[PDB]
PDB file of N, CA and C in Angstrom:
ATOM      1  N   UNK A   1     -28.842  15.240   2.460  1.00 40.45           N
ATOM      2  CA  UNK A   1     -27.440  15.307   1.946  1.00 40.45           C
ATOM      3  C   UNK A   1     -27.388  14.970   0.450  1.00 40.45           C
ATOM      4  N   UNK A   2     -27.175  16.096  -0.408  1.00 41.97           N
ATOM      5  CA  UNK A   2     -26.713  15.501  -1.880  1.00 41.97           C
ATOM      6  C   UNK A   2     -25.682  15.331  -1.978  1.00 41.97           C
ATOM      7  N   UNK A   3     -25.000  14.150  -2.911  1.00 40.15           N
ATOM      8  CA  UNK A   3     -23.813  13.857  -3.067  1.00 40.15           C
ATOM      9  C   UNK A   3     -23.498  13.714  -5.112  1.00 40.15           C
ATOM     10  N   UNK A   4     -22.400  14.247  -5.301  1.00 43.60           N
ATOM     11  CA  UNK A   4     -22.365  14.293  -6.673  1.00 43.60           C
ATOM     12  C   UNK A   4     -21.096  13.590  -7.293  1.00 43.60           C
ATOM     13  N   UNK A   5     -20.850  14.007  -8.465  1.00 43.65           N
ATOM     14  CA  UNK A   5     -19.612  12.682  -8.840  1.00 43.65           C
ATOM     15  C   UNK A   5     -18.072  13.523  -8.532  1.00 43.65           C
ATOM     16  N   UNK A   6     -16.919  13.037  -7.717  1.00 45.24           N
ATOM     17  CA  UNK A   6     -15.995  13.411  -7.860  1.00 45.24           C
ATOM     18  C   UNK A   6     -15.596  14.524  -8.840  1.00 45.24           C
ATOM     19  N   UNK A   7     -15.362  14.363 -10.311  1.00 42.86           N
ATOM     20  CA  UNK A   7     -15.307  15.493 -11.633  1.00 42.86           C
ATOM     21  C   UNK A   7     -15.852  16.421 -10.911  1.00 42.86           C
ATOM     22  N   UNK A   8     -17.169  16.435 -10.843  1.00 43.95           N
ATOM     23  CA  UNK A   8     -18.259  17.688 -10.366  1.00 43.95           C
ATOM     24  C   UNK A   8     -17.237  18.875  -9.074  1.00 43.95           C
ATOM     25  N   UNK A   9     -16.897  17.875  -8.143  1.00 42.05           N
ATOM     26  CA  UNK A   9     -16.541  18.669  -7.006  1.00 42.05           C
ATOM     27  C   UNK A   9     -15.251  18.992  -7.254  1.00 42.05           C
ATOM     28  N   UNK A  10     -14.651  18.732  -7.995  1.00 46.15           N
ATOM     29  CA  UNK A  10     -13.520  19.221  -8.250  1.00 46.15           C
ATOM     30  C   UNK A  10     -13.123  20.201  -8.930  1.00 46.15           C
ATOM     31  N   UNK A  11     -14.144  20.021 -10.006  1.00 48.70           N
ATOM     32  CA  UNK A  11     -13.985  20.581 -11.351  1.00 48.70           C
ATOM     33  C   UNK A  11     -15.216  21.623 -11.519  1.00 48.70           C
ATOM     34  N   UNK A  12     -15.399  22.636 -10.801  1.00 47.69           N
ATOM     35  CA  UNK A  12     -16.695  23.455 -11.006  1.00 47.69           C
ATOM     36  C   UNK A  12     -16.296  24.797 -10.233  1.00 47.69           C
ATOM     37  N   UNK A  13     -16.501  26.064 -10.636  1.00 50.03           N
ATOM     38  CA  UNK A  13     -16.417  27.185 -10.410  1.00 50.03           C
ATOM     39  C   UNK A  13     -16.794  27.518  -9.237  1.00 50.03           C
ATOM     40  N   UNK A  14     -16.874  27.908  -8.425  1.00 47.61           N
ATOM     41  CA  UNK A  14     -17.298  28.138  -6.727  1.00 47.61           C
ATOM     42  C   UNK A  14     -18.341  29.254  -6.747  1.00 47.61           C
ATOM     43  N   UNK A  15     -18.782  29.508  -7.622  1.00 48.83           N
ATOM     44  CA  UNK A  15     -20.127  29.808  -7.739  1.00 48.83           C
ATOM     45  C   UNK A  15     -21.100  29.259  -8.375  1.00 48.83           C
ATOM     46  N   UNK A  16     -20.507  28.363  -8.932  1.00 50.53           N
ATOM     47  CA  UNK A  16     -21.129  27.157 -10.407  1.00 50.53           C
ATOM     48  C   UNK A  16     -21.668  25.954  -9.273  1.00 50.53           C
ATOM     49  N   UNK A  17     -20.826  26.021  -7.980  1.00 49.47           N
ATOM     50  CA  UNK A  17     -20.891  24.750  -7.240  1.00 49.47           C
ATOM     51  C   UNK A  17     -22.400  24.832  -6.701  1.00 49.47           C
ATOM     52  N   UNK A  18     -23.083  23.184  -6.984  1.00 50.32           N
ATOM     53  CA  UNK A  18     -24.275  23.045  -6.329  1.00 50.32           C
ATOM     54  C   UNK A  18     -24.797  23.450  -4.744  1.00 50.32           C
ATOM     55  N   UNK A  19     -26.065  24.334  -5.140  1.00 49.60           N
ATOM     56  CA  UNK A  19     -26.243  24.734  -3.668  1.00 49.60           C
ATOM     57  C   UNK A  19     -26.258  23.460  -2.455  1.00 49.60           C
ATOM     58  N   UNK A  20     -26.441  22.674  -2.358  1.00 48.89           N
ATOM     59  CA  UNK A  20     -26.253  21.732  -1.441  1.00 48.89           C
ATOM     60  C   UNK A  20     -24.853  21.291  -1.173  1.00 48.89           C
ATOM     61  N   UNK A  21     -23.779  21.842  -1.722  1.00 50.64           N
ATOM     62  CA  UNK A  21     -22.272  21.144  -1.193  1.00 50.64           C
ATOM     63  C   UNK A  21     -21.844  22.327  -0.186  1.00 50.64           C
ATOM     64  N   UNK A  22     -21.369  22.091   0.748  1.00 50.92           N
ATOM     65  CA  UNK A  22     -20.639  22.841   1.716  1.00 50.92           C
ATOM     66  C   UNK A  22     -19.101  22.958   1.472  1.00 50.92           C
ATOM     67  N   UNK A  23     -18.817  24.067   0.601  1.00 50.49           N
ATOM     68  CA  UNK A  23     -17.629  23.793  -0.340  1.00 50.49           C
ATOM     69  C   UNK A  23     -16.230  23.868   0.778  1.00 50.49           C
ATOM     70  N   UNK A  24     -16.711  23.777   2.152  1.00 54.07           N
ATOM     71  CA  UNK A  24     -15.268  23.626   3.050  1.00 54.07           C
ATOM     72  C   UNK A  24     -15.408  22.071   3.515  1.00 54.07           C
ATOM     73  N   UNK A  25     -16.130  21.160   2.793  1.00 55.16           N
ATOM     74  CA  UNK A  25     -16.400  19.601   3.495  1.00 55.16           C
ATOM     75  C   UNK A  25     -16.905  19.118   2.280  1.00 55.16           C
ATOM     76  N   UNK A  26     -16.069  19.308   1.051  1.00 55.09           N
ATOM     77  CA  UNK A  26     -16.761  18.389  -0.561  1.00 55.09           C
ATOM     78  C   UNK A  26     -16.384  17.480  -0.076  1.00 55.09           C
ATOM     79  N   UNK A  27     -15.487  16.617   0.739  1.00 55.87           N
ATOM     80  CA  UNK A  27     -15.620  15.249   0.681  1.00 55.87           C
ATOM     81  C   UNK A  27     -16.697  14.372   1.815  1.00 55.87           C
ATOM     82  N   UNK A  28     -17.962  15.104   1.929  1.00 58.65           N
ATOM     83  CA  UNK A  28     -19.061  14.654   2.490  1.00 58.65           C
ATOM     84  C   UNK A  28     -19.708  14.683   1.252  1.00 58.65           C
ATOM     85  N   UNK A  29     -19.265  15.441   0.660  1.00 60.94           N
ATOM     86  CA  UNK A  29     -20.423  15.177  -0.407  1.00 60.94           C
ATOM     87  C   UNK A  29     -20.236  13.952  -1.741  1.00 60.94           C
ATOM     88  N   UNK A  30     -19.461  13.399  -1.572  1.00 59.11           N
ATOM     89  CA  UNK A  30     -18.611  12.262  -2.137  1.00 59.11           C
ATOM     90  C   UNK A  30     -19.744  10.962  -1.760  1.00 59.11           C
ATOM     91  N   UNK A  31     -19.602   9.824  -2.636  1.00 57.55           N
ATOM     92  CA  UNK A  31     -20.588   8.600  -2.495  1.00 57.55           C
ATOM     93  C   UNK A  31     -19.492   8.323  -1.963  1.00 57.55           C
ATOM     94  N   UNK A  32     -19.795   7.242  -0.723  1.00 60.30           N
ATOM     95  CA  UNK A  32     -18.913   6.517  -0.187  1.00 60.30           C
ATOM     96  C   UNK A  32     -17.788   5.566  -0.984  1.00 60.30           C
ATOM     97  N   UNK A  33     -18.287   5.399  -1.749  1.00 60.30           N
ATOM     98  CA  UNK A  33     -17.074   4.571  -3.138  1.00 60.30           C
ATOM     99  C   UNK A  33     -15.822   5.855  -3.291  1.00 60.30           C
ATOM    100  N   UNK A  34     -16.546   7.120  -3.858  1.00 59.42           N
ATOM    101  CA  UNK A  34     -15.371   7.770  -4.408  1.00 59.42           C
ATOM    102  C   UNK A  34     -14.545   8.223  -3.213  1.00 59.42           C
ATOM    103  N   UNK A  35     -15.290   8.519  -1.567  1.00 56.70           N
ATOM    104  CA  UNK A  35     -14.368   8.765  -0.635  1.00 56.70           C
ATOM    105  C   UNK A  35     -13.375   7.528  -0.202  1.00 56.70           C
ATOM    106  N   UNK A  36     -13.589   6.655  -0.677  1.00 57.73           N
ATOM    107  CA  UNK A  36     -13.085   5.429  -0.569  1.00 57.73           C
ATOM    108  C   UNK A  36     -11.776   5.325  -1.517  1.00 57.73           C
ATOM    109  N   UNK A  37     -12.025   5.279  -2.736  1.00 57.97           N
ATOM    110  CA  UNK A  37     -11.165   5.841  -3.270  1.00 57.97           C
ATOM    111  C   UNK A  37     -10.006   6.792  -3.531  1.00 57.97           C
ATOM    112  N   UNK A  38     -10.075   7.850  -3.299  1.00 59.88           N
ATOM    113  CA  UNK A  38     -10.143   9.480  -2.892  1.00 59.88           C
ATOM    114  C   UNK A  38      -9.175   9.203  -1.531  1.00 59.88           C
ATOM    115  N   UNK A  39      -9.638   8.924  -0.517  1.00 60.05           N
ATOM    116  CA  UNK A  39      -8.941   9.170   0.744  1.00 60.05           C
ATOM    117  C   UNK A  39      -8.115   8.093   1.677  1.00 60.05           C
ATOM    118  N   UNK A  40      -8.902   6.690   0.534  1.00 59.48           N
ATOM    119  CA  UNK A  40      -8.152   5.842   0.980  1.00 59.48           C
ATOM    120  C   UNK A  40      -8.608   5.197   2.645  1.00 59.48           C
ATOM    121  N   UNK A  41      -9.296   6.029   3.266  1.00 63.70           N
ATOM    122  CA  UNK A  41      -9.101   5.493   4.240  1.00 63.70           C
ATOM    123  C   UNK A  41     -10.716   5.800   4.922  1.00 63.70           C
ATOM    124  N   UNK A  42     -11.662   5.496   6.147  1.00 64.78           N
ATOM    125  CA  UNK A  42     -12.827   5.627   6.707  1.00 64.78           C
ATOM    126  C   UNK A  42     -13.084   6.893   6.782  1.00 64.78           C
ATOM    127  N   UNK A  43     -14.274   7.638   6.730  1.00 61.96           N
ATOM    128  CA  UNK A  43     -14.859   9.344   7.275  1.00 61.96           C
ATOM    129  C   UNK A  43     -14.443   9.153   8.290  1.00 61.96           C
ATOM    130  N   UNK A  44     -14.454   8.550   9.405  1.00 62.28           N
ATOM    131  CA  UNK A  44     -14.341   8.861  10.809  1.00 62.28           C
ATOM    132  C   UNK A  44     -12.687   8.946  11.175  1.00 62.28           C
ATOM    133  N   UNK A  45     -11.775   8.114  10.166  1.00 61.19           N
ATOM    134  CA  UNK A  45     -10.303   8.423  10.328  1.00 61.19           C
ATOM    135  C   UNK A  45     -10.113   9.632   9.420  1.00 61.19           C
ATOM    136  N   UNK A  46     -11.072   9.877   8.550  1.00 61.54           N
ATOM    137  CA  UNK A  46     -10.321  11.174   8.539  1.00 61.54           C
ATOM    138  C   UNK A  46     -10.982  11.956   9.060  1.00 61.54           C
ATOM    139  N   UNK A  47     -12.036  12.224   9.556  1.00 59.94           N
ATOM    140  CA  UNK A  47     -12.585  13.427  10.323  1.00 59.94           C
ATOM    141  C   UNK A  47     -11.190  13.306  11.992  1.00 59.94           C
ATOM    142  N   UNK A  48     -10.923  12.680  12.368  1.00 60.53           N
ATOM    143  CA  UNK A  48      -9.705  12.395  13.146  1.00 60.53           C
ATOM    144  C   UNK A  48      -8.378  13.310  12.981  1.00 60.53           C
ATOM    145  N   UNK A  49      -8.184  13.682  11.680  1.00 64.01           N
ATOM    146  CA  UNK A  49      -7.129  13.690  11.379  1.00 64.01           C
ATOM    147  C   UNK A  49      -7.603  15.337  11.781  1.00 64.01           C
ATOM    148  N   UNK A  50      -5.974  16.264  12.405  1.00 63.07           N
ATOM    149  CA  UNK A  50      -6.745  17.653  12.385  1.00 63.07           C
ATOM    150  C   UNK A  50      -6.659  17.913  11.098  1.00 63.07           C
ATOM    151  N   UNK A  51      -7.687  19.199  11.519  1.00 62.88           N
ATOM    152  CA  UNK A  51      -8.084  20.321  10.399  1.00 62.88           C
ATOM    153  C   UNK A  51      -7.693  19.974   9.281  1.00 62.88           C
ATOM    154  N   UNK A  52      -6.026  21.040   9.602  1.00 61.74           N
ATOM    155  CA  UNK A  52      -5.304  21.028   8.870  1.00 61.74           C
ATOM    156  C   UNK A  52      -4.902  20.509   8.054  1.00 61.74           C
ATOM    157  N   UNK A  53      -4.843  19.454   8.498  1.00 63.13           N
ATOM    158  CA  UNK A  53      -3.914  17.855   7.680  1.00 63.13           C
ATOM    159  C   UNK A  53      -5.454  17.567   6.954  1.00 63.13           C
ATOM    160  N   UNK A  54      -6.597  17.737   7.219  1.00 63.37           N
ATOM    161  CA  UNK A  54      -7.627  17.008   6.327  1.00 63.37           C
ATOM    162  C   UNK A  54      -7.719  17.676   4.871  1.00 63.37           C
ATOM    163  N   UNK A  55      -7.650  19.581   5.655  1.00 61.68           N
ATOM    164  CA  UNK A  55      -6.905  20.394   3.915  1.00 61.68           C
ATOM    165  C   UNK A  55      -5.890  20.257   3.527  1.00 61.68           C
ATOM    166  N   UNK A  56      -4.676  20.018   3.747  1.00 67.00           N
ATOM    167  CA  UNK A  56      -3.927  19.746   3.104  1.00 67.00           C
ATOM    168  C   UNK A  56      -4.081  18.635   1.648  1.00 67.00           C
ATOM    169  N   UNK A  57      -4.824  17.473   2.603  1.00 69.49           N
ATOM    170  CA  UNK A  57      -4.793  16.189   1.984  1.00 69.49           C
ATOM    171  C   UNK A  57      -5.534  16.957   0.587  1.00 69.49           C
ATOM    172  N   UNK A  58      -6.492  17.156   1.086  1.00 70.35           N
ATOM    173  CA  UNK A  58      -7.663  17.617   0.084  1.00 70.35           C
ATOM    174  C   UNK A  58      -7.274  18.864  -0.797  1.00 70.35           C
ATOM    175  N   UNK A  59      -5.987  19.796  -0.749  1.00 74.78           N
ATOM    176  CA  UNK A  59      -5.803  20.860  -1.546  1.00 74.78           C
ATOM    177  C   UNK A  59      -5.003  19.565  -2.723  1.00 74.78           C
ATOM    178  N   UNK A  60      -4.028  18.970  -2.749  1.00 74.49           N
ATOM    179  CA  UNK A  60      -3.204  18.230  -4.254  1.00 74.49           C
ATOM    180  C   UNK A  60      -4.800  17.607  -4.868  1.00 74.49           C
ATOM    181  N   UNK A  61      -6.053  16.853  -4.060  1.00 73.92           N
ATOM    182  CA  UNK A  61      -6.599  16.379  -4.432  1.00 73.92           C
ATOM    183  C   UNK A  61      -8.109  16.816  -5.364  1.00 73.92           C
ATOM    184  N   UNK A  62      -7.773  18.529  -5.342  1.00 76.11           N
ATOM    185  CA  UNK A  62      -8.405  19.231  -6.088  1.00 76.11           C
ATOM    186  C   UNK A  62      -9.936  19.521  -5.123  1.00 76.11           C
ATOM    187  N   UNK A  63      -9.776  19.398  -4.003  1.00 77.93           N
ATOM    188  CA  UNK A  63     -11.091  19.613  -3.060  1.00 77.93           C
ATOM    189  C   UNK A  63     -11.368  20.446  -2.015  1.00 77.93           C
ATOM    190  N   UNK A  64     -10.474  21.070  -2.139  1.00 75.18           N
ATOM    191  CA  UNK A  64      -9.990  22.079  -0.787  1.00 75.18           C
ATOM    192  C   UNK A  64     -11.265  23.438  -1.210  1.00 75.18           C
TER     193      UNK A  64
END
């Protein structure tokens, strides 16, 4: 699993994006600090949350 800095996953062309991010789950690819930050809340509460609601969260947050 590579993980890169927030800026990066946000901020990079979707073909520019590193082959190791799975650009429908950038916030796996997040260090646990910035998902911490970022989501506020545990991977496992938000893998919880449906689908939907996990893109949503993640489209204002520039990660969708």
């Amino acid at each position: 699993l590579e993980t890169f800095p927030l800026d990066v996953l946000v901020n990079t062309a979707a073909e520019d994006l590193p082959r190791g991010v799975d650009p429908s789950a950038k916030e796996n690819h997040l260090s646990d600090e910035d998902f911490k930050a970022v989501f506020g809340m545990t991977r496992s509460a938000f893998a919880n949350l449906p689908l939907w609601k996990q893109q949503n969260l993640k489209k204002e947050k520039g990660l969708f």
